[PDB]
Amino acid sequence: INWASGEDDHVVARAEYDFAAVSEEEISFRAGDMLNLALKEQQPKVRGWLLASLDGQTTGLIPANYVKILGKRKGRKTDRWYDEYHP
Numbered sequence: 001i002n003w004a005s006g007e008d009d010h011v012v013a014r015a016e017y018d019f020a021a022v023s024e025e026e027i028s029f030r031a032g033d034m035l036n037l038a039l040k041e042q043q044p045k046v047r048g049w050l051l052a053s054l055d056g057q058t059t060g061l062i063p064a065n066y067v068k069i070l071g072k073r074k075g076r077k078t079d080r081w082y083d084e085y086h087p
Contacts, residue, residue: 003038004053008075011037012085013052013067027052027060035067040081 002008015033019026029035035052037043038059043051049061069078071085 001053001059002075002077003042004036004059005056006036006073006075007077009039010073010075011039011081012070012073013037013050014070015062015067017066019063019066021060023061025061027054027058027062029054029062029066035062037067037069039072 003010013035015029015031015035018031019029021028033054035054036056038051046061048064050064050067051059052062052067053059069080071080071083073085
């Protein structure tokens, strides 16, 4: 998955809270962690959840309201989904 590694375009988000996956479908993260999100066009519709990667390889669901969306970032190859990410 090129969005997860940052090879493809992705959205960047910062974790607000700690989260432990309860299910195989979810991924764990710590408060302050930076995650890559799939673009709108690759996002599944699961109410309360977004598709993300913490480690660049595994992907899974995170609670949408546990992260702040920071903006879209170009691959190496609620309105913040549009703005570009400025580190």
